[PDB]
Amino acid sequence: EDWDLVQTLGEVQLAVNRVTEEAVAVKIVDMNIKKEICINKMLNHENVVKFYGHRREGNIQYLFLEYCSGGELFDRIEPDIGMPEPDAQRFFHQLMAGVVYLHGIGITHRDIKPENLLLDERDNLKISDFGLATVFRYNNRERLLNKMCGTLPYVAPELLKRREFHAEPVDVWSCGIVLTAMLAGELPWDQPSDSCQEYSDWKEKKTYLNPWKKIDSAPLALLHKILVENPSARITIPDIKKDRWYNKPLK
Template sequence: MSTEFVEGWEMLHTLGEGAFGEVKLLLNKVSGDAVAMKIVDLVKNANVTTSIKKEIAIHKKLNHPHIIKVYGNRKEQGVEYIFLEYASGGELFDRIEPDIGMKPQDAQKYFRHLISGVEYLHSLGIVHRDIKPENLLLDEHDNLKITDFGMATIFRMNGKDRMLDKQCGTLPYVAPEVLSGKQYHGEPADIWSCGVVLVAMLGGELPWDSPTNHCEDYVSWKECGITKQPWCKIENLALSILRRILNHSPPRRYKVSEIKQHQWFTKQFKDQGTPVKLPGTPLKKKIKLNRDSTGREEAILACSQPVHCDRTNQNHCDELQDRTSIGKKQVGLCSFSQPTNPEHMLLTSQCLGTQTQSGSNQTPLHRLVKRMTRCIMNTDFDKTRKELERLLDLFGYTWRECPQGTFTISCKDIRKMDLTFKANAMSLNGVSVLLDFRLSHGCGIDFKRHFLKIRGKLKPFISEVPMTWSLADATNTIP
């Protein structure tokens, strides 16, 4: 059920979650405006206080069409609330078909958006340091937006660049120099991550587990091996730009200006197509929400990256998103994200049996969009639950159901890293069930692989009827 967060604003379902909190959707009951609210419990996670302050300070400096906007923040009773632009198009990874990728023209469009945002960040002396599809959102107009600045830092102050030395990021996307144990430049490291994102978009898989000499796939790439997957699925012109972006030598790696001049980047595809207008209500005005308890915005940015992984000595190492060993330390951090990916239609007020003039009559499903990891079952609520339980046991997942109809599922991904996702069953008028899957932590592409495997076994019970029925009597709201 929805709850009122502050006067006039209802808190609806969960958009995403991380190691230190979650992201909820806020809806204005009168205007219908939507805001993503990131919630961090500083009492339970006291070691991230400095990092969160820095994240807010950096994010407030940013204003670019391909970066998620931050509207403000407030601190109340040990909880930090950060109010962000709601990207109703969901996460980029949901547009990537496992082992297939996406159309080259779509990959080019998103890559152009990504490079535009990264160029802006670097012009301000800021590096993101955790660029990956899970941190790249899409708005209602299918525009890419960079989000999650928890690992971002300043590399240039007063016109002077500084070297970085913290190991942070997500292993398959991190640049090799970041793992070297030596100092590195921030800009080339971000560019490398952008290149791995492009590989994922074009090939539907990641090129390696990590860019180290212990990884056979990475060594093969360094030695110009392109006969294996995913390289054999990528056409030559795209391989050309990838060769220059994923160069293991940072000084020889393409800069943003060179990327923008490359023939693949500027190419006009024959079937460029018409941009699809995705569902969702854009924010046309600035949302008025309280700032922090002091009423001030952070203006002074630190020159070092706060860390989270070592609770006893947090000045000596950064987080690597995938759980892996650096020396003898085990480190790990989940990102915040908004996995609410639409395909073609929003469950509108007409579908829901609600009024459009006032948000007060909207159900919590008003902002529910049809995403690729969702299906409608022609079985009732109890039978759907039992069938899902049977499949989860059959596939050997670790899972729990709490509350009833909400399943938290854990396993290892293809790289033996932790992967957690949720499945939520929602009864529709007692005759069918909406079964919704969303990623909680881990690789988005591998999450989709698991979803497709589960959906394949559920196929006999999946309804082929289009989603045009009323949801007014739906129960067990998606969290």
């Protein structure tokens, strides 16, 4: 109770300790929360929102989390424009670092989007909100996912047409949609279904349409590898790390 809740960040409130003046974010949820807490405890990476502690008072549960003064990545995207390629690439590298770490401890976020990618004072990206995250590897054994989870414009196509599916290619897909957003300042489709004209157009290689026309050939080639319908053919992270644009030096 040494923390004063200065303002509502998003419920999540900015909290400043009276003694140290340290600033953290506090997630206030009145009663899923248990799993989020469990998952958070496992996490320790420079590109994932740090979990400090939790305190439960009565029916109210408090989660203490790293405060990112930068705010969300979503705010760094100019509509219809995106952001400078060098900034996009840097955010993308940090995003891959975060995801590689999560997948490495068998955890999938399941809702990767710019709203859930926060920035600190140095504009370092931090993966945020593990309320929908789940274990997909335990005791070295992979568990396929069955629950439909996410945000439609970012979800992989298999999630909509498959009874069960691999967790990793789904997170790669959403990262691809985030990259598109950063480079084009717009989302390619409402959802990845054939009833969706925009998705159908992409599967037909109509890259003279937006948002594809706005994207340079190098990053677009990477997007051609990520936004692949067949999750088995989809490029994996180790291979993304070998992509030409990924490795291209930028201003």
